[PDB]
């Protein structure tokens, strides 16, 4: 797992940029915004995006004190391609995150964790190579 | 649900044709091949294909004596478009069904029910209208 | 599927009593509290309790405008016995339903449908015989 | 995980004994019999038993070339208790593994991996401490 600090945490108007290249034979990857980088036990997760290649899903959820929330899955299409570069932008807005892939809006995730400035970590794991974080 | 008879049941080399039109605002539909048309209590299901539109899944399972097997979801893409005509072909081969949508191979489902000639029913329900069965 | 009216719907302090006998060879049964008794298309579900005998689960969920929420399954034990009489009591509290089986507290389910007086229907289906409603 | 070698692998009549104590606040643990101890990439799994405490499940499956088979879950009851010692016995028979907990038969798992002598590793992970392997 990769953990990157987000100086100052999240606020409305704040954008997280994640570019990378999907692996040639991917099973899955995940990109999460979390409160601190603790792994034992695992930090509270404001949003986890998990891309699953076998059935072409974008699964979203949160985790608060070890408790998983409602999994959300609605998608217009599955945006990732094996061996291809991608650009994920997570935009923090007052009521929600808006998530873009390659410039296109893919889904919104309404806040379960309300304390936005505490969301100060990006965690990335799985079948990709990260080329840019901004 | 619609139930249609398949005279003589299934055998390697036999193809079932289903043409229809997806509803304008679909939620899900299912197309199943079953052993007889009993609904209470339900016939044994050799293959059920459920298309789910919100997260663009093609879910496959079987049912024997009321027991569902392992659901399968692997897809190269989701093939159905709201308000668009479709052509589904379920080809029975010796070890599996091979399923085609609009001429394209979408998945294999290996036989769980072994007695193919007893698979003599197609069941259709959900957000579509059927135009042809053959 | 049986439906029964609950005059005046739910409110804090109100209890729903369901007494019955599990069938000799049960697969599952379900007890739901719903907003009206419409079946096609199905009334909004405030809580559905589904007892699954094979792997001894109590699964809880809601349904709003045909959309299911997050299924909940946490249990201290599985409380039902084939061919045995039972007593379910659903206590509506301010924040949640508290569910008792044979006098013992089994789980809490927090309100998703907030308009409690609109929850005026009990729906019962599956492998049981109902002996009392109150 | 812990991995232990099982000299000569499995054969009919061979018993694996695992004793331990469940942690005070357990989420899950797993006990697996596998073909070699490779983690990268993970050995074939003949049987994985996963105990889940929240909803009291004993989930069984296999993994062959990274592909998980059909999850099995049927149970007479959930046998494990937080902060309490347990005795697991996996009996290898010709057609199946028979699993006992505290002297009681819990379930059978019919062989998916047919080459029994190749199953020569026990893998253990999760919210327990192991006191005996024999």
UniProtKB/Swiss-Prot annotation, chains A, B, C, D:
- GO MF entries: carbohydrate binding
Domain Galectin, residue spans: 1-130
Q: Which cysteines are joined by disulfide bonds?
A: none
Keywords of this protein's UniProt record, alphabetized? Answer: Acetylation, Lectin, Phosphoprotein
Tell whether Acetylation is among the UniProt keywords. Answer: yes
Q: Determine the domain of life of the protein's source.
A: Eukaryota
Q: How does it assemble?
A: Monomer.
**What does the protein in this record do?**
Does not bind lactose, and may not bind carbohydrates.
Q: What is this protein called?
A: Galectin-related protein
The record lists the organism as Homo sapiens (Human)
Which taxonomic lineage does the organism of this UniProt entry have? Answer: Eukaryota, Metazoa, Chordata, Craniata, Vertebrata
Q: Which residues of the full protein are shown?
A: 39 to 172 of 172
């Amino acid at each position: 797992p990769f953990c990157g600090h987000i100086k100052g945490g999240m606020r409305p108007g704040k954008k997280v940029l994640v570019m990378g290249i999907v692996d040639l034979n991917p099973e899955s990857f995940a990109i999460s915004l979390t409160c601190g980088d603790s792994e034992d036990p695992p930090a509270d997760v404001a949003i986890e995006l998990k891309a699953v290649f076998t059935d072409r899903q974008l699964l979203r959820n949160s985790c608060i004190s070890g408790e998983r929330g409602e999994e959300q899955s609605a998608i217009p299409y599955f945006p990732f391609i094996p061996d291809q570069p991608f650009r994920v932008e997570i935009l923090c807005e007052y009521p929600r995150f808006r998530v873009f892939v390659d410039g296109h809006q893919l889904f919104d995730f309404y806040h379960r964790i309300q304390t936005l400035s505490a969301i100060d970590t990006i965690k990335i794991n799985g079948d990709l190579q990260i080329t840019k974080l901004g």
